Amino acid sequence: QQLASFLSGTWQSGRGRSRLIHHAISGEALWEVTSEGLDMAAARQFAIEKGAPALRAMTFIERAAMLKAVAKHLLSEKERFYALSAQTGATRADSWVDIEGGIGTLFTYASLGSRELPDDTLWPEDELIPLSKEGGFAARHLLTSKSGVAVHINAFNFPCWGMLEKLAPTWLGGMPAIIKPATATAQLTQAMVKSIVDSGLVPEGAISLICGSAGDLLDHLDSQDVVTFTGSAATGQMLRVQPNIVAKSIPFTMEADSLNCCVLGEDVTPDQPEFALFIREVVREMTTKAGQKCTAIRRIIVPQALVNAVSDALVARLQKVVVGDPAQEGVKMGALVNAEQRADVQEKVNILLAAGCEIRLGGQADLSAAGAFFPPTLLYCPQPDETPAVHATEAFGPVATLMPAQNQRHALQLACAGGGSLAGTLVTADPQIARQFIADAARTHGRIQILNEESAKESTGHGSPLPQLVHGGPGRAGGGEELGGLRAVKHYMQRTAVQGSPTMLAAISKQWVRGAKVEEDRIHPFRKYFEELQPGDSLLTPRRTMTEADIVNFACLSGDHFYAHMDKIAAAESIFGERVVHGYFVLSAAAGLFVDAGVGPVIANYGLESLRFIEPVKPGDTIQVRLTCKRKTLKKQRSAEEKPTGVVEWAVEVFNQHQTPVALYSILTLVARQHGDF
Amino acid sequence: QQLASFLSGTWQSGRGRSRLIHHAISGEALWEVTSEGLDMAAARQFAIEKGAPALRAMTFIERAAMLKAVAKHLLSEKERFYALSAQTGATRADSWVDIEGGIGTLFTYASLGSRELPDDTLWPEDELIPLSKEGGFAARHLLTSKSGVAVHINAFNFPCWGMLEKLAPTWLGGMPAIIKPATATAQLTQAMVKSIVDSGLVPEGAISLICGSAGDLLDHLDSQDVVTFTGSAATGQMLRVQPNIVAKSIPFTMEADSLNCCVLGEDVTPDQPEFALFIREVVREMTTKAGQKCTAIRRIIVPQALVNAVSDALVARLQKVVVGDPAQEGVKMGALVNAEQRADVQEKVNILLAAGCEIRLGGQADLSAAGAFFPPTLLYCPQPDETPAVHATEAFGPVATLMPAQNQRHALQLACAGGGSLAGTLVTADPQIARQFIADAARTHGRIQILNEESAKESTGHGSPLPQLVHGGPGRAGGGEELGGLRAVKHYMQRTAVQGSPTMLAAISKQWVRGAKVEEDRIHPFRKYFEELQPGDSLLTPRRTMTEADIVNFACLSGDHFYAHMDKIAAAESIFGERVVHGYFVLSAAAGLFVDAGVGPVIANYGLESLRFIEPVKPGDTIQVRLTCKRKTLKKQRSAEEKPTGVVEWAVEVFNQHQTPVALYSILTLVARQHGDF
Amino acid sequence: PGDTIQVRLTCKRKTLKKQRSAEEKPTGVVEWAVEVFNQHQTPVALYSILTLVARQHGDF
């Protein structure tokens, strides 16, 4: 039953030297995997000629909606994925984290995209940068999709999460994806790819899959493609010096093995809740998915005095973990994915012992049984700062090393001796200890959690990467960065500075910018439905002369009697030199000048975005407002009942009688549409 | 006279095989350069043991002040720099570009840093991310300095701008720098390093200088270091696969040779001003410092019909450029820097001719003269889309190739045929043309300018990278990114997600976050001076019950009679279902509840940052405000006269009587300090 | 109009009130001196206000 790979739009396989996928529990070879003789160049050309322009023609909103649809469809069919995940040696909870976290990543990126990306195919990322004095020359930065294909080489740990956490920003960025899973678990990736393809929800050529070897696919890439790698450091570093990849300046992100730490702060005593949650945390991160997560804890750093009590508690809670076939009731920790991984973990443990580690629990595994089971293992390092192997060697399984520290600073040095890690944890109740730990050791960790009693009730965990937070680390951890919210979307896009006149920048951005041409229409802009509005639709209001009576009435009604408005003596000694009008009254009176009173398309206001008070307004000044439609963003109907709306941002400029701007800001509104999209 | 290297705090030189620095005009060898036998490992250790912690102890405000002081001291002594620049073959305007642009980059980064970086040693880049339902578990992203040293390997084009361009963000990020200029022009870099060092304005070990070869410096770097390279693509791609750099995941960004284009829009005709400014632009970019800038125009793409007119105009304007010794009155364009560079330019021109290019203006130089002069060379390519060498070969001199296009889209394809460029220019007057060009060709360009009549008045240029805009490009341009404002500062820092309870995150951040512990005083916070204020100092105000009278009075005073407030019939079928209170009146009444009236340390309000209206406020509801000090930022006294103030951001939270929030926002404020720092 | 006023509020006289029972809250009577000045610091109004003020400790 050879495993097919989906490329050039067809399901096909290869012929030659194979590899086998065994059952992690029984040991039977239940899949054969090979991709020899497949035209890799044809697959790349297929993804580029028809997948990429199809994705790029969609606006960001349409791509986010497509992410959401795909997530829903994948969620409806999760039972198939659970049944396949059972073959890899996972309990129901590990398959849960993998499956449900991958789909939840899709949902999170869909939400972020809908909420904060433009309704366009281009993405203007910052505000307009003025580069002159009369305003004829300005700049802003834009992001456009790269035109190539994204190749994601994933590791066996998370066959579904590891694919979707990369796939979601790849599509949100507008790029097709060629996915190459790890051979040892490709059967679970294939089924999810087949589900996505058979849903009909994504464009043709937007997703390809290589089961087996990539062949010479990297030799055919050019500078508009991107490559991401997850796995062993040797394979990644070999890929990093790929002659084609270095000749074309192809972006390459690497995520290697890291030695994640968990530190116990000096301030805690064994009679505190922090001690118990620390023990529970170390055990959970040691034992979930048999400790095969990239973020699983590998080094435990405790104060010298606490070592014996900590070791007693760890072995006590850790002996109560039953390893076996999760289909049996009473099993809490399954097996490694194959006997090869078991041999690798055993030889790493043997290296650590040969380099000066004592067994506290279960160092040797049954290296002959059918299932790839490993017993939970807790090691001890007595000379932590002169045993350099414990800071470089990572057994990729339920194995962790306890080690002592001193004076709360030796612990920081030991945490940094890892050489760059993905995740670290500090259990403490003292906020100053946590400040010191961050300021000293954040530079070697990609993610750090301070774990006290309050955070422990809803904390997601030491080993769980959330889609909103970056996932990566320096040095030993590869150097790359994933999952930083929209930070990940930007890795599939080119950033470009665009210089020119404001009017040109407005036309290019499809958003109005300061100083650009406007259009006046003799119909108030608040009477136009969403579709009739264009950026640059502008209204000059009538004037209102400020008076002393306005200062008095506003101070009274609001209750703000700040001396700058109500005290002549104190105002004379201020920077302005006399009494001025309240800034909030300038804001309110401006709204009074431009707001259309009667029922119309404008539904809500709900938001003001960047208000600066530039010049003071005095009694005797006359103010006037220009209201320009700045940006529009359609909102997708989440049902057939909801009335179709869109978001409109408006630029507001308040001028005095010298045409001098005295206030600048944006308002957000909800505006109704004439045509919904169900 | 041998050029010294400043490493380990001492001025020293090397002994062995040397390179010679010849005068570009006369040809005399006036410097000898070698660094053999210098302890590079000692230099790096000197940078990281005393330069790096010294820079890291400074807040971003102090490092910005140090940048400004260094820029001033450099500007005062610019005559020496101009004199050493004369030796390189530069007219007064080219040296002005280099010297004043480098110093202006320092000034700009000082300004950006003092204006928008925290008064701390850590940089919290984003707002708090809630990760729980009850608010016990959240996260935000921090940036902290890396521990290592930054090695900047610079090119000969811009010996002053090329160093300070990288040095400003390196220091602002808290990293020591080791500068390695190009040997051919290291005399100008040495003098600027001498100025900086004998100024006494920077910490010890914050800048080192290697004149000549780098020896084995790259072999001794670890994961906390960063490397940058500008120059030849072969040398950079060799550095990219340096075995130590790849084994340790050391960040490495490369900038190489790019074929910058300049398209003429289909809309323009010879009778338009666009045509004249297009000619002027191509000629200025061709002849400024002999066309030796990385952003010089190399490919001119015009419509097939305009080809002969453009070729007449370019030749005419370009014969008027007098090349010679710029010390002679009447010279407009100087020499190249070396006879070696002149030979390289000549052989690139010969390759282009051998690949099918027509001479339009002189293309043969004097390969025996003492000065390294090259005449302005304008080539012609008759069949642009089938001679691939015109899109791959770059003569680093006063050489540019004219080529024809068709149908407005062949020109876009030609622009993209360069394989990734730093800069491109489109001359047009039609904004739709500009939008099409951007949307299709931004992905292969790092910077693009739309050049019309309005922008021509104050346009800084095609070839001048401004410090606010990114400087880089994909593919053939190396793939790197520089100068993007604070974007470049973040390349010398590590980004880290920190999860925990809001109280822990507030301690780590030194800024109050939503949900964190506050502290109340019995003294109103607005009566405290800057130094007495602490993030989290908080005031619960008294309550104000909203009535129908308040709605009527505010609508009357402000003029806003929007139906949701004043029309009970229309409000009946709104989403709220009855009349509500104006959001701006909620804002004003909140200010009335918390603002202290009497003269105190609070000087100005001037700002409101992120206002959302969460829930409607109805008549009969009672509101109460919690005002919390969120973030403090000291402002440096720019004289001894001005009063010392600081910037305080305040968190405002308005609650109704169910303790439900109805408005959240921040106010900015100027607060007087007790003690200035002159 | 154009004059600026400022007030000094001074506690003038305190008089404790005996609790009628063990139930009623213990208050006292405070008379306050009020002095309103204009910007030449000359007084423009003088008067006293009476006030009921809550006590911390009753005497049943």
Residue numbers in the entry:
A (entry chain B), B (entry chain K): 2 to 679
C (entry chain E): 620 to 679
From the article:
In this study, the effect of physical and chemical factors on the orientations of macromolecules was investigated through an analysis of selected well studied macromolecules, and important parameters that determine the behaviour of proteins on cryo-EM grids were revealed. The test proteins used in the analysis include human C-reactive protein (CRP) pentamer, CRP decamer, human erythrocyte catalase, SARS-CoV-2 spike protein, E. coli PaaZ and E. coli β-galactosidase. We performed a comprehensive examination of how macromolecule orientations respond to alterations in physical factors, such as freezing temperature, and chemical factors, such as the addition of surfactants or the presence of affinity tags, during grid freezing for a standard set of proteins. Hence, electrostatic interactions at the AWI are an important factor in determining protein orientations in the absence of any additive.
PaaZ is a bifunctional enzyme and consists of six poly­peptides, where a domain-swapped dimer assembles to form a trimeric structure. We previously reported the structure of PaaZ, a bifunctional enzyme from E. coli that catalyzes two steps of the phenylacetic acid degradation (paa) pathway. In the previous study, the structure of PaaZ was determined at ∼2.9 Å resolution using graphene-oxide support grids. In an earlier study, when frozen in ice, the enzyme was found to form clumps and aggregates, which was overcome by the use of graphene oxide and a low concentration of protein. PaaZ adopts a preferred side view in the absence of an additive when frozen in ice at 4°C, with a tendency to clump or cluster. However, clumping of the particles was still observed at 20°C. Hence, CTAB was added to the sample and the grids were prepared at 4°C, which led to less clumping and consequently resulted in a high-resolution map at 2.3 Å, as described further in the next section. In the current study, we obtained a high-resolution map using CTAB as an additive during grid preparation, with D3 symmetry and higher order aberration correction during image processing. The resolution estimated by comparison of the half-map FSC (at a 0.143 threshold) is 2.3 Å, and a comparable resolution of 2.4 Å is obtained from comparison of the map-versus-model FSC (at a 0.5 threshold). In the case of PaaZ, the presence of a polyhistidine tag also causes a preference for the view that contains the affinity tag, but this is the side view of the protein, which contributes maximally to the reconstruction, and hence with very little sampling of alternate views the reconstruction is not as anisotropic as in spike.
